[PDB]
mmCIF file of C-alpha atoms in Angstrom:
data_model
loop_
_atom_site.group_PDB
_atom_site.id
_atom_site.type_symbol
_atom_site.label_atom_id
_atom_site.label_comp_id
_atom_site.label_asym_id
_atom_site.label_seq_id
_atom_site.Cartn_x
_atom_site.Cartn_y
_atom_site.Cartn_z
ATOM 1 C CA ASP V 1 -11.996 -6.010 -229.207
ATOM 2 C CA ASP V 2 -15.080 -4.019 -229.462
ATOM 3 C CA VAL V 3 -11.810 -1.570 -227.581
ATOM 4 C CA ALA V 4 -9.011 -2.274 -230.488
ATOM 5 C CA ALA V 5 -11.497 -1.056 -233.008
ATOM 6 C CA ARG V 6 -12.276 2.258 -231.107
ATOM 7 C CA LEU V 7 -8.789 2.594 -230.658
ATOM 8 C CA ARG V 8 -8.179 2.177 -234.457
ATOM 9 C CA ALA V 9 -10.808 4.840 -235.372
ATOM 10 C CA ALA V 10 -9.919 6.840 -232.475
ATOM 11 C CA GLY V 11 -6.175 7.188 -234.946
ATOM 12 C CA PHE V 12 -4.120 5.225 -232.709
ATOM 13 C CA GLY V 13 -0.941 3.319 -234.049
ATOM 14 C CA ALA V 14 -0.070 -0.275 -233.984
ATOM 15 C CA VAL V 15 3.012 -1.548 -232.534
ATOM 16 C CA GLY V 16 4.199 -4.639 -232.602
ATOM 17 C CA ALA V 17 2.299 -7.522 -234.311
ATOM 18 C CA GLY V 18 1.046 -6.906 -237.351
ATOM 19 C CA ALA V 19 3.578 -4.249 -239.075
ATOM 20 C CA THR V 20 7.217 -4.455 -239.980
ATOM 21 C CA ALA V 21 10.019 -3.461 -237.205
ATOM 22 C CA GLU V 22 10.718 -0.140 -238.909
ATOM 23 C CA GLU V 23 6.785 0.355 -238.990
ATOM 24 C CA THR V 24 6.442 -0.039 -235.046
ATOM 25 C CA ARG V 25 9.697 1.736 -234.806
ATOM 26 C CA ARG V 26 8.581 4.731 -236.170
ATOM 27 C CA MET V 27 5.500 3.777 -234.720
ATOM 28 C CA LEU V 28 6.809 4.673 -231.150
ATOM 29 C CA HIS V 29 8.778 7.158 -232.142
ATOM 30 C CA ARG V 30 5.570 9.127 -232.872
ATOM 31 C CA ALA V 31 3.622 8.395 -229.102
ATOM 32 C CA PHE V 32 6.714 9.638 -227.257
ATOM 33 C CA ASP V 33 6.695 13.184 -229.494
ATOM 34 C CA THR V 34 2.827 13.100 -229.010
ATOM 35 C CA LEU V 35 2.953 11.583 -225.054
ATOM 36 C CA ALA V 36 5.721 14.636 -224.321
ATOM 37 C CA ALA R 1 25.390 -7.615 -223.937
ATOM 38 C CA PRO R 2 23.587 -6.411 -227.083
ATOM 39 C CA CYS R 3 20.524 -3.473 -224.945
ATOM 40 C CA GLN R 4 21.810 -1.824 -222.225
ATOM 41 C CA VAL R 5 20.226 0.552 -219.372
ATOM 42 C CA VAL R 6 21.811 2.036 -216.092
ATOM 43 C CA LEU R 7 20.163 4.405 -213.402
ATOM 44 C CA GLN R 8 22.188 5.258 -211.455
ATOM 45 C CA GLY R 9 22.808 8.903 -208.984
ATOM 46 C CA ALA R 10 20.893 11.103 -210.342
ATOM 47 C CA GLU R 11 18.916 9.657 -213.137
ATOM 48 C CA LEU R 12 17.508 6.649 -211.048
ATOM 49 C CA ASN R 13 16.953 9.329 -208.453
ATOM 50 C CA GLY R 14 14.962 10.823 -211.158
ATOM 51 C CA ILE R 15 12.893 6.909 -212.168
ATOM 52 C CA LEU R 16 12.010 7.474 -208.706
ATOM 53 C CA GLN R 17 10.908 10.788 -208.691
ATOM 54 C CA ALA R 18 8.635 9.804 -211.768
ATOM 55 C CA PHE R 19 7.034 6.384 -210.149
ATOM 56 C CA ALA R 20 6.472 7.972 -207.214
ATOM 57 C CA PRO R 21 3.265 9.689 -207.591
ATOM 58 C CA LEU R 22 2.092 6.717 -209.385
ATOM 59 C CA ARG R 23 1.961 3.753 -206.159
ATOM 60 C CA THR R 24 1.140 0.502 -207.674
ATOM 61 C CA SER R 25 -0.787 1.393 -210.523
ATOM 62 C CA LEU R 26 1.558 0.290 -212.937
ATOM 63 C CA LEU R 27 3.447 -2.487 -211.584
ATOM 64 C CA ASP R 28 1.371 -4.901 -214.046
ATOM 65 C CA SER R 29 2.294 -3.317 -217.366
ATOM 66 C CA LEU R 30 3.296 -4.030 -220.787
ATOM 67 C CA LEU R 31 7.466 -3.174 -221.098
ATOM 68 C CA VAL R 32 7.322 -2.160 -224.250
ATOM 69 C CA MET R 33 11.693 -0.951 -225.740
ATOM 70 C CA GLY R 34 13.478 0.078 -228.646
ATOM 71 C CA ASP R 35 15.943 3.042 -229.391
ATOM 72 C CA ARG R 36 13.457 6.056 -228.125
ATOM 73 C CA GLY R 37 13.379 4.462 -224.411
ATOM 74 C CA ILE R 38 11.371 2.613 -222.168
ATOM 75 C CA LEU R 39 7.367 2.230 -222.961
ATOM 76 C CA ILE R 40 4.600 0.928 -220.556
ATOM 77 C CA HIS R 41 1.690 0.933 -221.042
ATOM 78 C CA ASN R 42 -1.574 -0.600 -219.448
ATOM 79 C CA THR R 43 -5.763 -0.437 -219.138
ATOM 80 C CA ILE R 44 -6.631 1.992 -215.474
ATOM 81 C CA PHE R 45 -10.752 1.698 -215.551
ATOM 82 C CA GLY R 46 -10.243 0.876 -219.028
ATOM 83 C CA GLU R 47 -8.881 3.322 -219.815
ATOM 84 C CA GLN R 48 -5.666 3.987 -221.785
ATOM 85 C CA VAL R 49 -2.742 5.175 -219.951
ATOM 86 C CA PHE R 50 1.051 5.338 -221.037
ATOM 87 C CA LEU R 51 4.254 6.679 -219.388
ATOM 88 C CA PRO R 52 7.273 7.155 -221.745
ATOM 89 C CA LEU R 53 10.911 6.996 -220.245
ATOM 90 C CA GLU R 54 12.777 9.031 -223.132
ATOM 91 C CA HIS R 55 15.883 7.010 -223.864
ATOM 92 C CA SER R 56 17.654 10.165 -222.182
ATOM 93 C CA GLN R 57 16.246 10.157 -218.546
ATOM 94 C CA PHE R 58 18.014 6.871 -218.108
ATOM 95 C CA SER R 59 21.688 6.768 -216.761
ATOM 96 C CA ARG R 60 23.216 4.935 -219.894
ATOM 97 C CA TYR R 61 20.997 3.766 -222.541
ATOM 98 C CA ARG R 62 22.173 1.582 -225.619
ATOM 99 C CA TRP R 63 19.220 -0.730 -227.919
ATOM 100 C CA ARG R 64 19.928 -2.602 -231.246
ATOM 101 C CA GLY R 65 17.765 -4.421 -232.914
ATOM 102 C CA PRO R 66 13.751 -4.704 -233.227
ATOM 103 C CA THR R 67 11.478 -3.387 -230.600
ATOM 104 C CA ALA R 68 10.793 -5.664 -227.719
ATOM 105 C CA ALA R 69 8.351 -5.910 -225.219
ATOM 106 C CA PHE R 70 8.198 -7.762 -221.223
ATOM 107 C CA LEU R 71 5.059 -8.249 -218.983
ATOM 108 C CA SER R 72 6.275 -6.295 -215.857
ATOM 109 C CA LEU R 73 5.181 -9.400 -213.008
ATOM 110 C CA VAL R 74 7.885 -12.132 -213.185
ATOM 111 C CA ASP R 75 5.148 -13.543 -210.930
ATOM 112 C CA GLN R 76 1.960 -12.185 -209.272
ATOM 113 C CA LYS R 77 3.535 -10.724 -206.013
ATOM 114 C CA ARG R 78 6.277 -9.128 -207.633
ATOM 115 C CA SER R 79 7.247 -7.017 -210.239
ATOM 116 C CA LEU R 80 10.077 -5.894 -213.217
ATOM 117 C CA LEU R 81 9.236 -1.837 -211.866
ATOM 118 C CA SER R 82 9.290 -2.969 -207.709
ATOM 119 C CA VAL R 83 12.730 -1.901 -207.223
ATOM 120 C CA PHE R 84 11.558 2.211 -208.504
ATOM 121 C CA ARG R 85 8.020 1.332 -205.726
ATOM 122 C CA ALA R 86 8.385 4.065 -203.618
ATOM 123 C CA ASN R 87 9.965 2.828 -199.987
ATOM 124 C CA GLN R 88 10.639 -0.852 -200.791
ATOM 125 C CA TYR R 89 14.678 -0.791 -201.715
ATOM 126 C CA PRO R 90 15.502 1.670 -199.194
ATOM 127 C CA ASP R 91 19.379 1.129 -199.800
ATOM 128 C CA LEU R 92 18.842 1.589 -203.496
ATOM 129 C CA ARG R 93 22.207 2.652 -205.630
ATOM 130 C CA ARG R 94 21.720 0.884 -208.564
ATOM 131 C CA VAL R 95 19.931 -0.586 -211.148
ATOM 132 C CA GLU R 96 20.883 -2.764 -214.826
ATOM 133 C CA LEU R 97 18.806 -4.151 -217.520
ATOM 134 C CA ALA R 98 20.099 -6.153 -220.090
ATOM 135 C CA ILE R 99 18.739 -7.666 -222.720
ATOM 136 C CA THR R 100 20.160 -11.193 -224.367
ATOM 137 C CA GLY R 101 19.618 -12.637 -227.173
ATOM 138 C CA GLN R 102 17.651 -12.058 -230.313
ATOM 139 C CA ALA R 103 13.657 -11.664 -231.428
ATOM 140 C CA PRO R 104 12.079 -13.235 -230.996
ATOM 141 C CA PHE R 105 13.946 -15.262 -228.030
ATOM 142 C CA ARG R 106 15.671 -12.419 -226.376
ATOM 143 C CA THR R 107 15.555 -12.067 -222.100
ATOM 144 C CA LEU R 108 15.766 -9.215 -219.772
ATOM 145 C CA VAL R 109 17.580 -9.935 -216.622
ATOM 146 C CA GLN R 110 17.617 -7.175 -213.991
ATOM 147 C CA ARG R 111 19.793 -5.864 -211.905
ATOM 148 C CA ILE R 112 19.471 -4.245 -208.346
ATOM 149 C CA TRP R 113 22.133 -2.696 -206.388
ATOM 150 C CA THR R 114 22.309 -1.398 -203.024
ATOM 151 C CA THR R 115 24.723 0.917 -200.876
ATOM 152 C CA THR R 116 26.062 -2.633 -199.828
ATOM 153 C CA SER R 117 28.366 -2.672 -201.763
ATOM 154 C CA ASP R 118 31.166 -1.089 -204.979
ATOM 155 C CA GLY R 119 30.689 -0.693 -208.087
ATOM 156 C CA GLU R 120 28.881 -3.011 -210.460
ATOM 157 C CA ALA R 121 30.845 -6.400 -209.950
ATOM 158 C CA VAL R 122 27.259 -8.616 -210.439
ATOM 159 C CA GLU R 123 28.118 -10.935 -209.406
ATOM 160 C CA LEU R 124 28.223 -8.984 -205.932
ATOM 161 C CA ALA R 125 25.558 -6.991 -204.609
ATOM 162 C CA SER R 126 22.075 -7.476 -205.664
ATOM 163 C CA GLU R 127 19.179 -8.948 -206.118
ATOM 164 C CA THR R 128 17.495 -10.403 -210.227
ATOM 165 C CA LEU R 129 14.520 -10.729 -211.926
ATOM 166 C CA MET R 130 14.355 -12.181 -215.298
ATOM 167 C CA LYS R 131 11.368 -12.258 -218.255
ATOM 168 C CA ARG R 132 11.283 -13.929 -221.372
ATOM 169 C CA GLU R 133 10.528 -11.206 -224.081
ATOM 170 C CA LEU R 134 7.293 -11.797 -226.286
ATOM 171 C CA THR R 135 7.471 -14.137 -229.010
ATOM 172 C CA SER R 136 4.399 -11.308 -230.167
ATOM 173 C CA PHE R 137 2.896 -8.747 -228.498
ATOM 174 C CA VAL R 138 0.832 -5.474 -229.719
ATOM 175 C CA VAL R 139 -0.491 -2.338 -229.013
ATOM 176 C CA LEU R 140 -2.447 0.308 -229.843
ATOM 177 C CA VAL R 141 -0.782 3.722 -229.500
ATOM 178 C CA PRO R 142 -1.376 7.571 -230.209
ATOM 179 C CA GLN R 143 0.074 9.893 -232.367
ATOM 180 C CA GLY R 144 -0.381 12.996 -234.459
ATOM 181 C CA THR R 145 -0.467 16.231 -233.154
ATOM 182 C CA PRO R 146 -3.555 18.331 -231.431
ATOM 183 C CA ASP R 147 -5.653 19.894 -232.644
ATOM 184 C CA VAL R 148 -6.254 22.307 -229.031
ATOM 185 C CA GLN R 149 -3.897 22.332 -225.989
ATOM 186 C CA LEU R 150 -4.846 23.283 -222.928
ATOM 187 C CA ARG R 151 -2.312 23.303 -219.715
ATOM 188 C CA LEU R 152 -4.757 23.707 -216.494
ATOM 189 C CA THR R 153 -2.448 23.803 -213.098
ATOM 190 C CA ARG R 154 -3.202 21.794 -209.922
ATOM 191 C CA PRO R 155 -6.439 23.139 -208.724
ATOM 192 C CA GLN R 156 -7.504 23.713 -212.133
ATOM 193 C CA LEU R 157 -7.553 20.832 -213.028
ATOM 194 C CA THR R 158 -8.743 19.530 -210.188
ATOM 195 C CA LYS R 159 -11.888 22.127 -210.287
ATOM 196 C CA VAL R 160 -12.330 19.940 -214.117
ATOM 197 C CA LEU R 161 -12.260 16.783 -212.713
ATOM 198 C CA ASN R 162 -14.834 17.541 -210.212
ATOM 199 C CA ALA R 163 -16.869 19.342 -212.966
ATOM 200 C CA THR R 164 -17.127 16.026 -214.815
ATOM 201 C CA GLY R 165 -20.298 13.242 -214.461
ATOM 202 C CA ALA R 166 -19.811 10.340 -213.689
ATOM 203 C CA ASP R 167 -22.291 7.989 -214.554
ATOM 204 C CA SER R 168 -23.692 6.618 -218.613
ATOM 205 C CA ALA R 169 -26.864 9.335 -217.437
ATOM 206 C CA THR R 170 -24.315 12.000 -217.143
ATOM 207 C CA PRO R 171 -22.295 12.948 -220.320
ATOM 208 C CA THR R 172 -19.772 15.567 -220.051
ATOM 209 C CA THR R 173 -19.146 18.486 -222.389
ATOM 210 C CA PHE R 174 -15.313 20.358 -223.001
ATOM 211 C CA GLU R 175 -16.407 22.953 -224.900
ATOM 212 C CA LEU R 176 -14.119 25.941 -226.399
ATOM 213 C CA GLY R 177 -16.245 28.512 -226.450
ATOM 214 C CA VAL R 178 -15.561 32.105 -228.834
ATOM 215 C CA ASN R 179 -13.667 33.942 -226.683
ATOM 216 C CA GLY R 180 -11.688 31.624 -225.817
ATOM 217 C CA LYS R 181 -13.771 30.626 -223.178
ATOM 218 C CA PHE R 182 -12.606 27.141 -221.758
ATOM 219 C CA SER R 183 -15.550 25.336 -220.469
ATOM 220 C CA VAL R 184 -16.235 21.600 -218.280
ATOM 221 C CA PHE R 185 -20.015 20.876 -217.295
ATOM 222 C CA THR R 186 -23.287 18.477 -216.769
ATOM 223 C CA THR R 187 -26.400 18.842 -215.839
ATOM 224 C CA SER R 188 -25.253 20.017 -212.738
ATOM 225 C CA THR R 189 -21.219 21.321 -212.735
ATOM 226 C CA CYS R 190 -20.023 23.679 -214.462
ATOM 227 C CA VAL R 191 -17.360 24.939 -214.529
ATOM 228 C CA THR R 192 -14.690 28.048 -216.621
ATOM 229 C CA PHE R 193 -11.723 29.437 -217.387
ATOM 230 C CA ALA R 194 -9.976 31.813 -220.234
ATOM 231 C CA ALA R 195 -7.860 30.305 -222.460
ATOM 232 C CA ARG R 196 -5.452 32.273 -224.156
ATOM 233 C CA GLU R 197 -2.172 31.006 -226.257
ATOM 234 C CA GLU R 198 0.922 30.899 -224.585
ATOM 235 C CA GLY R 199 2.785 33.558 -225.789
ATOM 236 C CA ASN R 200 -6.099 35.087 -213.089
ATOM 237 C CA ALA R 201 -7.205 31.084 -211.113
ATOM 238 C CA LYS R 202 -9.376 31.454 -214.212
ATOM 239 C CA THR R 203 -6.629 31.957 -216.924
ATOM 240 C CA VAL R 204 -5.738 28.242 -218.319
ATOM 241 C CA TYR R 205 -3.275 28.522 -221.696
ATOM 242 C CA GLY R 206 -2.576 26.630 -224.380
ATOM 243 C CA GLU R 207 -2.073 26.382 -228.354
ATOM 244 C CA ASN R 208 -3.937 27.063 -230.866
ATOM 245 C CA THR R 209 -6.818 28.851 -227.902
ATOM 246 C CA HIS R 210 -8.769 30.296 -230.969
ATOM 247 C CA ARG R 211 -10.634 26.837 -232.573
ATOM 248 C CA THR R 212 -13.854 26.411 -230.920
ATOM 249 C CA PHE R 213 -15.482 22.810 -230.035
ATOM 250 C CA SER R 214 -18.298 21.299 -228.233
ATOM 251 C CA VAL R 215 -17.081 17.999 -227.389
ATOM 252 C CA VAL R 216 -19.045 14.742 -225.334
ATOM 253 C CA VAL R 217 -16.906 12.615 -223.208
ATOM 254 C CA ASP R 218 -18.693 8.417 -222.810
ATOM 255 C CA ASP R 219 -19.603 7.729 -219.706
ATOM 256 C CA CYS R 220 -16.475 9.883 -218.187
ATOM 257 C CA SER R 221 -13.929 8.060 -215.748
ATOM 258 C CA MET R 222 -11.570 10.876 -216.333
ATOM 259 C CA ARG R 223 -12.042 11.114 -212.368
ATOM 260 C CA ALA R 224 -11.029 7.860 -211.077
ATOM 261 C CA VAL R 225 -8.627 7.366 -213.208
ATOM 262 C CA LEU R 226 -6.893 10.817 -212.837
ATOM 263 C CA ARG R 227 -7.147 11.046 -209.205
ATOM 264 C CA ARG R 228 -5.358 7.003 -209.537
ATOM 265 C CA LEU R 229 -3.055 8.054 -210.891
ATOM 266 C CA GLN R 230 -2.815 10.632 -208.411
ATOM 267 C CA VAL R 231 -2.417 13.874 -211.198
ATOM 268 C CA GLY R 232 -1.088 17.070 -210.295
ATOM 269 C CA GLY R 233 -1.381 20.028 -212.971
ATOM 270 C CA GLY R 234 -1.420 18.316 -216.761
ATOM 271 C CA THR R 235 -1.947 19.005 -219.776
ATOM 272 C CA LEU R 236 -5.075 18.586 -221.696
ATOM 273 C CA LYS R 237 -5.089 17.187 -225.624
ATOM 274 C CA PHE R 238 -7.742 17.357 -228.243
ATOM 275 C CA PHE R 239 -7.319 15.229 -231.222
ATOM 276 C CA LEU R 240 -10.354 16.717 -232.661
ATOM 277 C CA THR R 241 -10.250 15.203 -236.842
ATOM 278 C CA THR R 242 -10.481 11.173 -236.102
ATOM 279 C CA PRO R 243 -13.193 9.968 -236.284
ATOM 280 C CA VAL R 244 -12.822 9.542 -233.135
ATOM 281 C CA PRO R 245 -12.011 12.698 -230.924
ATOM 282 C CA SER R 246 -9.439 11.614 -228.162
ATOM 283 C CA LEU R 247 -8.985 13.419 -224.825
ATOM 284 C CA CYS R 248 -5.261 12.343 -224.277
ATOM 285 C CA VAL R 249 -4.145 14.369 -220.418
ATOM 286 C CA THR R 250 -0.634 14.484 -220.345
ATOM 287 C CA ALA R 251 0.607 15.414 -216.521
ATOM 288 C CA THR R 252 2.529 18.217 -215.711
ATOM 289 C CA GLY R 253 6.287 16.971 -215.024
ATOM 290 C CA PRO R 254 9.171 15.459 -215.258
ATOM 291 C CA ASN R 255 8.376 11.823 -216.611
ATOM 292 C CA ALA R 256 4.132 12.504 -216.297
ATOM 293 C CA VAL R 257 2.632 9.379 -216.671
ATOM 294 C CA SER R 258 -1.035 9.923 -219.744
ATOM 295 C CA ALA R 259 -4.916 9.051 -219.554
ATOM 296 C CA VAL R 260 -6.347 8.668 -223.196
ATOM 297 C CA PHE R 261 -10.275 8.860 -223.485
ATOM 298 C CA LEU R 262 -12.292 8.816 -226.386
ATOM 299 C CA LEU R 263 -15.143 11.515 -226.842
ATOM 300 C CA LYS R 264 -18.614 10.278 -228.438
ATOM 301 C CA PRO R 265 -18.192 10.576 -232.308
ATOM 302 C CA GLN R 266 -19.802 13.674 -234.129
ATOM 303 C CA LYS R 267 -21.187 14.867 -237.936
#
């Protein structure tokens, strides 16, 4: 979709689907950090 | 059970307060659970919305194995976040989440307890909801450190939101000027405050208030979204370097939601 492309161009990290378990595990930690 | 999450006393009160201002805004959402807590994701008026519940906010939180995602709705009118709904559970005493099994076939069983029993004998008092994880799911989430942060009080955020445009024919500019002068305006509205690095209602505090910028928000849904989430005050975080700039507004408070809006790309 056009939004996923926009979000990717905005720096958003992928969680789930196309990533290893340790990768999305790392991404969630970063999201909570920046979201805090 | 391998994964256990418990809300009781203090922490249940905390979660209940976190949800109060949110009303029904997150009933239909994606629950992303992992060793860090539960990340509740949604889209409101098309904008990215997130609500992080740090594991430390629960009475007990134990997580093992890969991260897991669940659709909060067990059915059209009922959700795994309905317990936390304002006054739907008057005698609410305890809420427990248990995830059993192995990816990609784990199951979430949510058990509720009211002031009509003692302890958690399980079989005893209750109301229970069950949900299968997602086998496959994808979520784009924000990351990295914002280049600028401006903490605004309730009335300040309100002045700002009232200034932002509301249509494709009325662009909005967020501008951090030379002197540390913060302004938000349209071709018919303007509002300005004085930055100042956090070591008088026109003074806003922030981080790196020396880094100027002049960003424009697209068709701006900011006001509608934030008004819907009933955000009191909040912190504006600007991510200026990525190809597409982005403005994340995190609500002020213990377990505040955030709405992330995309800014028009520059250069």
